[model samples]
Target: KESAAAKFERQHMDSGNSPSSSSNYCNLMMCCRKMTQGKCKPVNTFVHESLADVKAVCSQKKVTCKDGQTNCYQSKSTMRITDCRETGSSKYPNCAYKTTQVEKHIIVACGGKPSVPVHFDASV
Candidate 1:
């Protein structure tokens, strides 16, 4: 099995899109022990234009596995947030207010693991 750092490095650190200079690497440790113990899985994922990163933005803050809303498993690991950026449009000229953030979370359970790795970056 790959260590958390190894997996992170393999997935993002060596990628061409990764930042070359000072950067912050954030990780979310999670396990598949129970329904409530798992993380939230978003229905529709989004991408930030500037960073060109994708993320599964949770529609609801919390989710339950029992109600078919989530799942449970027995694996612990770390996920990465590769990038993020702001949302913009001609109408919304202000880039400050259009800025947004993205991050990744692990979601597992049910017949198979529904978890996915996402990259979220923001202007801030």
Candidate 2:
């Protein structure tokens, strides 16, 4: 079974690489990250911050999760991120994406002992 922390890493963390100034970023990264297996992910965000720093969010000021849970936490500082959204004409097996890069404080839902990011809630 894939742990929530592992899944979170697969979907959100991207500290090792920086985005190119091209829409091709999402088109390539979506496939490379195995998120295009079934259908193109409608929206996904990759944080260009260290995994340790990202995990540290779990200990930042607590906040309500998107689902109304109290397990979410917001980052203490803004982080660079790249958002990938599916294009209107994108087709399954031939995923397409639009890349948008920004700097924002990220939010994540945490769980388990030594709390870790279980879900990416949003950015503020």
Candidate 3:
């Protein structure tokens, strides 16, 4: 099994490709990454930033996490990202998604071994 941080890298860390790669990016990636297994994850984000840059977010000091207990941090600057949201179809094996790209300061929660990003938290 993959660790949380590795999962983050696999499922969310997609800084190489352009957010506008194609209209079917979400549709293709969701299944390609196996996010469509048991069910389609309602929402997922892919950060179009470098791996080191994204991990560096753990060192940033911000308003703190929404849950108010974890060590959360924000990105130093606005980042390009693509948000994959499940479209109308919700049934298993028949899930679809809509890809919306945007720029914002992303917030993340750090925890577990070595203290890496575990949650995508939100983007401001």
Candidate 4:
């Protein structure tokens, strides 16, 4: 069964791809990741770090989530990531996106036993 942590990884993790290969990164990834089926996600971030490192964030600095959740934590170290922004021309099933890469400390919402990241909050 798919868990929140599992869904987070499916939507945001792209560990094998760094910086992105081309301008079509988001176009390809969004579809490849099944984020373009019914409607394209407006904005998303893909982390280019190990799953172990990402999950470890759950034990890092505690912080407040954007939604004011108390279960969020911030990574102590900066990490490589890519931001995918949907373009104005983009539409459902034909989602187009711009890819931007950066390195930053990330925040994630953690939950469940042996608490793990269930949401990608933000990068700072």
Candidate 5:
């Protein structure tokens, strides 16, 4: 039984490898709050990292966001490998990594006002 934060870290660790070395993965049924017109809104973003990078990011003495939130969890399920290819020259080719396309469902209030309780899934 893995916690959500733990799962997120595991997913982040799976990134940064060559696609040939990993299997394709997907995430489903992730939930988050939706934004309102004039209120606090939740914004979610995923930053993919390798094992070493995850260690470094987590080892930081302090992590803070502009909104005064000091705690953040890396997404475990959203990070996955893709079948994209490397581009450019052979010696210094650039990796053409693909990002997961997110499908979002937003709840609308009366008069088409945006409401909370949005659900979405992101995968690659």
Candidate 6:
């Protein structure tokens, strides 16, 4: 089975959808990707980078996790990413996301037996 962190990366962190097609990308992807199952995932982000680059962040800057754990890491590179923010009017089966992009450092929370990412902490 896929770990929760891996699933988040796969579902919420992937972005090969192309810049042209990325407009309103979240509205389409969040559903097609099946993340809007029972309830809408309010906010999510998709990194337009490689899996290796993301994983490598674990050994990069090494920041404190949200829960104050020591396994968090910050990206040393400027990365392109998409932010999916749920619109206020959205509700249940009718879900929506405001799409935006930015280049910044990303922080993540990593854990588990072998120490893999389990949360997409934040970006700035």
Q: Quick one: best TM-score, which candidate?
A: 4
> Each candidate's lDDT (Cα)?
0.27, 0.78, 0.76, 0.79, 0.28, 0.75
Point out the higher-scoring one by TM-score: 1 or 6: 6
lDDT of 3 at 23: 38
- Judged by whole-model lDDT over C-alpha atoms, candidate 1 comes out at 0.27
Instruction: Give RMSD to native, each candidate.
Output: 14.7, 2.4, 2.6, 2.2, 15.3, 2.4
- Tens digits of per-residue lDDT for model 3 on 18-52? 55544377678768888678777888878768877
Cα-based RMSD of candidate 6: 2.4
lDDT of 3: 0.76
TM-score of each: 0.22, 0.83, 0.80, 0.84, 0.30, 0.80
- For 8-100, candidate 4 gives per-residue lDDT tens digits of 887787776545454487677777878577777888888878989988887989886657745898999999877878874676666778777
List candidate 5 stretches off by more than 4 Å: 10-13, 20-48, 61-63, 72-124
Worst 10 residues of 6 by lDDT: 15-24
Per-model tally of clashing residue pairs: 10, 0, 0, 0, 3, 0
Note the residue pairs that clash in candidate 3: none
Superposed on all Cα atoms, model 2 deviates from the true structure by an RMSD in Å of: 2.4
1-124 in candidate 2: lDDT tens per residue? 6677877787777675655654786676668888678766788888878888887777888887757754989999898777878773677776777777789898878887768888788898
Error of 1 at 29 (Å): 26
Instruction: Note the residue pairs that clash in candidate 4.
Output: none
Model 2 alpha-carbon drift over 4 Å, by segment? none
- Predict model 4's lDDT versus the native: 0.79
The residue pairs in collision within model 2 are none
Considering only N, C-alpha and C atoms within 3 Å, which residue pairs clash in candidate 6? none
Give the per-residue Cα lDDT of candidate 5 at 106: 14
